Amino acid sequence: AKLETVTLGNIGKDGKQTLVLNPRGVNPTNGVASLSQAGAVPALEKRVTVSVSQPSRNRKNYKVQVKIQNPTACTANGSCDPSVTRQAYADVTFSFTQYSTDEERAFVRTELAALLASPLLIDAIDQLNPAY
Amino acid sequence: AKLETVTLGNIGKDGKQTLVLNPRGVNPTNGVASLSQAGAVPALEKRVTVSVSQPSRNRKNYKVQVKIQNPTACTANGSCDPSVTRQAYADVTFSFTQYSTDEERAFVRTELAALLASPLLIDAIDQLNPAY
Amino acid sequence: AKLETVTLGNIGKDGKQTLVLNPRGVNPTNGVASLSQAGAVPALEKRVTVSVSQPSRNRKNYKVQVKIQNPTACTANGSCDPSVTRQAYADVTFSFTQYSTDEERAFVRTELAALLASPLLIDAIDQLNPAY
Amino acid sequence: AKLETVTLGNIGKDGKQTLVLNPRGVNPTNGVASLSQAGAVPALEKRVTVSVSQPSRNRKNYKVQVKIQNPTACTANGSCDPSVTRQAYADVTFSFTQYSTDEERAFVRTELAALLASPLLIDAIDQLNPAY
Amino acid sequence: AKLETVTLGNIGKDGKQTLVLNPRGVNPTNGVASLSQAGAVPALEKRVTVSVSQPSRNRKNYKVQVKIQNPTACTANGSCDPSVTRQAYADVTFSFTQYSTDEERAFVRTELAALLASPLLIDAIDQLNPAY
Amino acid sequence: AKLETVTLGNIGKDGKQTLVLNPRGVNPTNGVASLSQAGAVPALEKRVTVSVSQPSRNRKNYKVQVKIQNPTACTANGSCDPSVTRQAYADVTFSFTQYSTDEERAFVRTELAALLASPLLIDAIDQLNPAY
């Protein structure tokens, strides 16, 4: 949704950390807005991208795609321009019919939050553990 | 990580609960967990599909994926059987390297909940709003 | 203007009804602001959009444009979902010059509203009966 | 819509201008109705015209157009004869199906008048920002 | 960055103040802010515009572009209408890598302000004195 | 214009650094003034240059172009002579009317120094923040 500064709080393993995302403008060729960690160096700024578009004159379906891109740096090592290794992503899409109501959309999204917050997935992602 | 009955909810758009997903029917030929309301009516119900993958020589990385299915059923005139008409879906893929920490994964996980709860996404689908 | 949940009132045949148009972002490929009916049915939503460029791009004007779509819909008996059977449209274009006065522009805007109120257009539109 | 002298009020930024335009008949070669200003010089007059199209061969709907024109002129450079200088005008069209609802024909007309009063359009033509 | 009304003192030979440029939106197709003192008759108005570009195929750098638009108009010197006859402007481009720190981006920013305030540019720009 | 030793105090993101630039002169191939950072060659490379173009016989349009570059030196372990990364730079041009006054030009020169000095550019440049 609208670009502005976005604060993500109550995050990390303890659920106590915060991250502030500065907005970045929209690339009209794909309709993608971007936000990133409000740090000094882009090479290591965690990124969030939006996306979010109306049903097309082909197959309809309201669709979104939301990405998380999280880089890390090491010693450098020996470089004055530190190398970057991506450690992790998320790529979340949604698809809704043109007749979909607010509650269908809200439940798919808040179910995802409720589900990721379930120990089944908390542990599966923190561990990279299949559920059994 | 561990299969358990999932009684998710509290925050639909109206502050209502959505349940219950029974983690039963795990697919043994791809190792994919199956969470569902489908136990009552498999043709017309809500499901969550959960998979985790370990690295091999053809990828050398880790994957976590959750698929959310929320079909809506209706009985058309002349039918004695409701069928799915309107539908809503979501699909999230996460990916990690072998040097990825649990702390970074927790950030990707918790940042996503923060994003799902944040106006950045509770507008993007609910108000059908692109980033303006 | 800034997209807002715009409420119109004193509208329709008796001049007594209302309509709420919610922000749906702007189209990023042409910078056109868009609102649509608040009710959650994208398939059949009423739409209003606004374009306000200046002469640089086309070395001309640029005329201000407002687009209106009213996709009148009806549910066939026995259908689970309504569809558009008739549509009404409007395209309102106003002149602009980089050297024009804001008062001149207001004169035309308000003149149009006064004309829409005038019986000459009430018949040109309600009957589809052009002036004679 | 019989042409009659129109005496409009509520015109301009503060709604304090009025405008009176007298019938000049209808041009039967294109079906265009016209109301004139009492000024002597055609190039210097304010005027309104009306035209409605119809379904026909290669035409699917009725198109209702009103032309609003308000030239601005002055005795530039000391001229004994004033001239335009500025063209403040609007091309406003509506279109309807032959099976359309009269209530809806009224709504698009009245919705536009309501939209014209609303910040959404008053700034769009009198003084608006790109979009936003 | 986030738009605000900008109140700039110390402008011109005597340090005349205050020049006030209000946030009068952002062009959605290219991220361009438009600041202005009034905007009623744009040709005759003073403006500053700003955008930030991201790297893409073609260029690996991040860019910040600021443009200053200050046309000078003549009053209605018998013409009965003011117009632009002379103009000054600036087109200011900054470019940075993914490894640039904020500290460094700021040197280019503050060095330029410090240089603009220095005799080398006071003479190069105000008297158009040649290099020597 | 005329070259002198230039000291730029109160620079960088905290406004605390002082830079001393030693003029070298004007390169006769293109008439471009140059100021070098007053140390080792890799530091000297962090040059500021000025091109003052008098209105051309075939264009008129005076132009003053200021180029700022700041390559960052880095020596690898086992190396001596550092390589540099052109992490940050700018290219700024002032123009154009041959009939403009020193005040019109000073207005633009100082307007930019005042903008570079303002929160919008402090953030637009130091953290690459968009017009949000």
Author numbering:
A (entry chain M), B (entry chain C), C (entry chain D), D (entry chain N), E (entry chain E), F (entry chain O): 1 to 132
Reproduce text from the manuscript describing this model.
The coat proteins (CPs) of single-stranded RNA bacteriophages (ssRNA phages) directly assemble around the genomic RNA (gRNA) to form a near-icosahedral capsid with a single maturation protein (Mat) that binds the gRNA and interacts with the retractile pilus during infection of the host. The canonical ssRNA phage Qβ has a genomic RNA (gRNA) of 4217 nucleotides, from the 5′ to the 3′ end, encoding the maturation protein (Mat); the major coat protein (CP); the minor capsid protein A1, which is a read-through extension caused by a leaky stop codon for the major CP; and the β-subunit of the RNA-dependent RNA replicase (Rep). Like many other viruses, the CPs of ssRNA phages can also assemble into virus-like particles (VLPs), which are not infectious. Through a native infection without engineering the amino acid sequences, we found that Qβ CP can form diverse VLP capsids, including the T = 3 icosahedral, T = 4 icosahedral, prolate, oblate, and a small prolate form elongated along the 3-fold axis.
Surprisingly, we have also observed that about 1.7% of the VLPs show a “walnut-like” prolate shape. A 3D reconstruction of these particles reveals that they are a prolate form with T = 3 and Q = 4, where T and Q describe the triangulation number of the two caps and the elongated faces, respectively. The elongated faces of the small prolate consist of two triangulation numbers, Q1 = 2 and Q2 = 3. Figure 3A shows the five forms of the VLPs from the wild-type Qβ, each containing 240, 210, 180, 150, and 132 CP copies for the T = 4, prolate, T = 3, oblate, and small prolate forms, respectively. Though all of the 5 forms contain 12 copies of the pentamers, they consist of 30, 25, 20, 15, and 12 copies of the hexamers for the T = 4, prolate, T = 3, oblate, and small prolate forms, respectively. For the prolate VLP, there are three types of hexamers. The “normal arched” type, which comes from the prolate, oblate, small prolate, and regular T = 3 capsids, has a θ angle of ~155°. Interestingly, the hexamer located on the equator of the prolate capsid has an arch angle of ~180°, which is defined as a “straight” type. The same procedure can be repeated to generate a prolate capsid from a T = 3 capsid. One can even repeatedly add hexamers in a multiplication of five in the middle of the prolate to obtain the rod-like VLP particles previously engineered.
